[PDB]
Amino acid sequence: KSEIAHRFNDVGEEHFIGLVLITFSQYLQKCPYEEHAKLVKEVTDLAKACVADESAANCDKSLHDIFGDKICALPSLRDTYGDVADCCEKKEPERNECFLHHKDDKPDLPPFARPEADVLCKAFHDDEKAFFGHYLYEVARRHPYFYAPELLYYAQKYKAILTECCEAADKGACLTPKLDALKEKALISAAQERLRCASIQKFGDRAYKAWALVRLSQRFPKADFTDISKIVTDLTKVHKECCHGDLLECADDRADLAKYMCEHQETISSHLKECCDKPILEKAHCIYGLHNDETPAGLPAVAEEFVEDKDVCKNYEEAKDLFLGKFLYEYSRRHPDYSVVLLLRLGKAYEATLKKCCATDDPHACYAKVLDEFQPLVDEPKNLVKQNCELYEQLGDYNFQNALLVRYTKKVPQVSTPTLVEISRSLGKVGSKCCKHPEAERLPCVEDYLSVVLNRLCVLHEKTPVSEKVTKCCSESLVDRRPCFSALGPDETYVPKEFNAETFTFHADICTLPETERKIKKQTALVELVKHKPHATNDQLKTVVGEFTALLDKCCSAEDKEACFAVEGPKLVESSKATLG
Ligand SMILES: C[C@H](C(=O)O)c1ccc(C(=O)c2cccs2)cc1
């Protein structure tokens, strides 16, 4: 019978350890590494016991519960992690819910800092196993929903970079570009998974199902509806699980799904060839991001099945999900150029037209132009991508982030500074990722990445709500979030923040920051300016940041750093007020 044995045997020891360290780092984000390693040994030992006897030890119990019992075993928790000991005194299947609800999307943690190359390679040389325990633990605690088996994949890429670079001439010059690139992939991965989890948990299984139906219909245009559907069903269970902290099950299930798709690759995509050769993680990663197969030629016009067919209303009425799944499949596989959110928006339009029209005396006369009515929904996002790409190319990264920071702060000034600056910085990454593709490739690139970034604002804001406008964009339809945020003008009801000296007065710590961190400091300041003076002009703002820049250059090459900051700090505070009013 025993679950931990089945799972142990299934994913094998190596992945088993990692998934259990991930599980523990996800539930208990503030515990020291050394504490988590012990919980993992104690759990590994148990599975190698349930390897012997199916009835030998606690092997009868659900995984939810083996994790349950291990946390509360050390009451050391009640103190630094005594908020969720409220959960330890409760029971299943109600307890494990308490645990999951306290996952902190923004734990109070210093940044994961990366050591000098010499030092990082030394740590990896001395103890490799400890090294990647540390890594899984530092990423998973900071991103409590990261897609667990993709995390394993990234650990493995990370080790391949240290192997290549640690013996090198200049270790730094070899590591830095490669780590920085790996880090960016992992952030995007974390943001995509957080979106799946939020769709599932906040808007229901169906909302991710539809999303995954569209995306897989674009990716695998030749595969038939019943196959896509089967893939959509299994991938739903996969992410429902991972999103719920059932990582052993998720990893195992995701493996069967990779296997099933390779074993049936003939009738899915020719591009599956690239993936099916590969060892497990590499294979499932490859699948998970495969570029779109080409559209089969000779498909009938979509109007035949969805406008002229005499059973349109009977289909919609008698089997709604089946019929509208088909609409999504058919429409999406033929539109790799559209974003997922757009396609879902067309689904919603089509459905609302049917609902309304099929309840009239003459449904056909009412819905005949439904596909033609998609045009203005297609044009809004295409226009926006184009205007914003020209702005990106015109201003460059930093000034584009600046313009979005100003626009967003005026939009939702109640939002906290670190969130506004994070969210603006992500918005400017989209310019860089996407505006170099030709016109046709741009929309799915931009709009799908916007989803991920808006979701990130929505999860942060859910924790501590402060803006009615965010809450509204974030909780109405998932698929309208981008248009919803787009349509917000400046919030003219916000009462400007008091002028606040220490949010504007600077100290010598700051001189140690690399230029990239100084940018964030300039950008944090700009946000506080816009909060203080929401009608400030772009020239006003450029002049205050300009002064900030001069203060920094000046006091950062002083021998007496604290005392130049004292002479100049308050002289900035005084020139800011003057420029601003
Ligand atoms: C949702 C938000 C907004 O306008 O408030 C938004 C909308 C569109 C874009 C946009 O089109 C681009 C960003 C980067 C390159 S193009 C950026 C941000």
Q: For the residues of 294-340, what is the DSSP string, one character each?
A: PPPTTPPPHHIIIII-TTHHHHHHHSHHHHHHHHHHHHHHT-TTS-H
Query: By C-alpha distance, which of 106, 160, 111 is closest to 132?
Result: 160
Contact in structure between 460 and 105 (CB atoms under 8 Å): yes
Contact in structure between 7 and 16 (CB atoms under 8 Å): yes
What is the topology classification, in CATH, of domain 117-198?
Answer: Serum Albumin; Chain A, Domain 1 (1.10.246)
Please name the residue that has the structure tokens 């700051």: 510
Q: How far apart are CA 164 and CA 171, in angstroms?
A: 10
Contact in structure between 133 and 21 (CB atoms under 8 Å): yes
Nearest-CA residue for ligand 1 atom 17 is 427
Q: How far apart are CA 456 and CA 535, in angstroms?
A: 27
Measured from the Cα of 385, ligand 1's closest atom is: 11
Record the resolution, in angstroms.
2.3
Q: How far apart are CA 294 and CA 307, in angstroms?
A: 25
Measured from the Cα of 400, ligand 1's closest atom is: 14
Q: How far apart are CA 280 and CA 248, in angstroms?
A: 15
Q: How far apart are CA 163 and CA 168, in angstroms?
A: 10
Q: How far apart are CA 293 and CA 272, in angstroms?
A: 9
Measured from the Cα of 407, ligand 1's closest atom is: 5
Q: Where are the domains of the chain?
A: 3-102, 117-198, 199-289, 302-380, 384-487
Contact in structure between 243 and 197 (CB atoms under 8 Å): yes
246 is in an annotated binding site: yes
Nearest-CA residue for ligand 1 atom 11 is 385
560 is in an annotated binding site: no
**SS3 assignment, position 581:** coil
Residues 6+ apart with CB under 8 A from 492: none
Helix axes 320-333, 205-219, angle to 10 degrees: 30
486 lines ligand 1 (CB under 6 A): yes
What is the topology classification, in CATH, of domain 302-380?
Answer: Serum Albumin; Chain A, Domain 1 (1.10.246)
Q: How far apart are CA 479 and CA 189, in angstroms?
A: 20
170 is in an annotated binding site: no
Q: How far apart are CA 581 and CA 579, in angstroms?
A: 6
Contact in structure between 325 and 211 (CB atoms under 8 Å): no
DSSP 413: T
Q: How far apart are CA 108 and CA 225, in angstroms?
A: 46
- Other CB atoms closer than 10 Å to residue 183's CB: what's the count? 15
- Other CB atoms closer than 10 Å to residue 90's CB: what's the count? 14
The three-point CA angle 448-151-71 to 5° equals 120
423 lines ligand 1 (CB under 6 A): no
Query: By C-alpha distance, which of 294, 289, 287 is closest to 273?
Result: 287
Query: By C-alpha distance, which of 33, 36, 54 is closest to 44?
Result: 36
> Ligand 1 centre from 147 Cα, in Å?
26
Contact in structure between 121 and 162 (CB atoms under 8 Å): yes
457 lines ligand 1 (CB under 6 A): no
Report in angstroms the alpha-carbon separations of 354 from 293, 306, 365, 430. 31, 10, 12, 36
Q: Extract the tokens encoding 269.
A: 């995509």
Ligand 1 pocket test, pick from 409, 436, 455, 482 with the greatest ligand atom count within 8 Å of Cβ, gives 482
DSSP 200: I
Q: How far apart are CA 171 and CA 563, in angstroms?
A: 38
Q: What b/e sequence results for 337-367 when a residue is b if at least 16 CB atoms lie within 10 Å of its CB, and e otherwise?
A: bbbbbbbbbbbbbbbebbeebbeeeebeebb
Q: How far apart are CA 341 and CA 449, in angstroms?
A: 10
> Would you say the CATH fold of 117-198 matches that of 3-102?
yes
Residues 6+ apart with CB under 8 A from 539: none
Peptide bond connecting 111 to the previous residue in cis, omega within 30 degrees of 0? no
Measured from the Cα of 411, ligand 1's closest atom is: 5
Nearest-CA residue for ligand 1 atom 9 is 388
Please name the residue that has the structure tokens 């090198």: 168
Amino acid letter, 64: H
Q: Which long-range contacts (CB under 8 A, 24 or more apart) does 259-268 make?
A: 260/234, 261/231, 261/287, 264/227, 267/222, 267/223, 267/224, 267/227, 268/220, 268/222, 268/223, 268/227
Q: How far apart are CA 343 and CA 322, in angstroms?
A: 17
What is the topology classification, in CATH, of domain 384-487?
Answer: Serum Albumin; Chain A, Domain 1 (1.10.246)
Q: Extract the tokens encoding 170.
A: 């200049």
Please name the residue that has the structure tokens 């103190």: 79
Helix axes 3-27, 148-166, angle to 10 degrees: 70
256 is in an annotated binding site: yes
Q: Looking at domain 3-102, which of 1.10.246.10, 2.40.110.10, 3.30.70.1400, 3.40.50.1100 is its CATH number?
A: 1.10.246.10
Ligand 1 pocket test, pick from 394, 397, 404, 449 with the greatest ligand atom count within 8 Å of Cβ, gives 404
174 lines ligand 1 (CB under 6 A): no
Q: Extract the tokens encoding 318.
A: 């008698």
Backbone torsion region of residue 360, taken as left when φ is above 0, otherwise alpha when ψ lies between -120 and 50, otherwise beta: beta
> Ligand 1 centre from 490 Cα, in Å?
15
Contact in structure between 218 and 292 (CB atoms under 8 Å): yes
Alpha helices by DSSP H, listed for 112-224, are 117-126, 128-142, 148-166, 171-198, 205-219
385 lines ligand 1 (CB under 6 A): yes
Measured from the Cα of 429, ligand 1's closest atom is: 14
DSSP string covering 477-537, please? -GGGHHHHHHH----TT-------GGGS---GGGGGS-HHHHHHHHHHHHHHHHHH-TT--
What proportions of the chain, in percent to the nearest 5, are helix, strand and coil? 75, 0, 25
Q: How far apart are CA 271 and CA 538, in angstroms?
A: 49
Q: Rg of the chain over CA atoms, in angstroms? A: 27
Residue 62 has phi, psi (to 5 degrees) of -55, 150
Widest pairwise Cα distance in the chain: 85
DSSP 285: H
Report in angstroms the alpha-carbon separations of 111 from 63, 226, 356. 32, 46, 53
Residue 182 has phi, psi (to 5 degrees) of -65, -50
137 lines ligand 1 (CB under 6 A): no
Query: By C-alpha distance, which of 508, 522, 503 is closest to 565?
Result: 508
Q: How far apart are CA 522 and CA 511, in angstroms?
A: 13
Residues 6+ apart with CB under 8 A from 278: 286
Q: Extract the tokens encoding 183.
A: 């880090």
Query: By C-alpha distance, which of 345, 378, 306, 328 is closest to 216?
Result: 328
DSSP string covering 18-71, please? HHHHHHHHHH-TTS-HHHHHHHHHHHHHHHHHTTT-SSSSSTTS-HHHHHHHHH
> Ligand 1 centre from 176 Cα, in Å?
30
Residue 368 has phi, psi (to 5 degrees) of -55, -30
Q: Extract the tokens encoding 448.
A: 């799908």
DSSP 113: P
Q: How far apart are CA 210 and CA 321, in angstroms?
A: 10
6 is in an annotated binding site: no
Ligand 1 pocket test, pick from 380, 382, 384, 406 with the greatest ligand atom count within 8 Å of Cβ, gives 384
Nearest-CA residue for ligand 1 atom 6 is 486
Q: Looking at domain 199-289, which of 3.40.50.1110, 3.50.50.60, 1.10.246.10, 3.40.630.10 is its CATH number?
A: 1.10.246.10
Q: How far apart are CA 19 and CA 252, in angstroms?
A: 11
252 is in an annotated binding site: yes
Helix (H) or strand (E) holding 286, with range, is helix 280-288
Q: How far apart are CA 575 and CA 544, in angstroms?
A: 8
Q: Extract the tokens encoding 63.
A: 């995984």
Amino acid letter, 229: S
DSSP 93: T
219 lines ligand 1 (CB under 6 A): no
Residues 6+ apart with CB under 8 A from 222: 267, 268, 269, 293, 296, 333
Report in angstroms the alpha-carbon separations of 157 from 96, 154, 183, 285. 32, 5, 11, 11
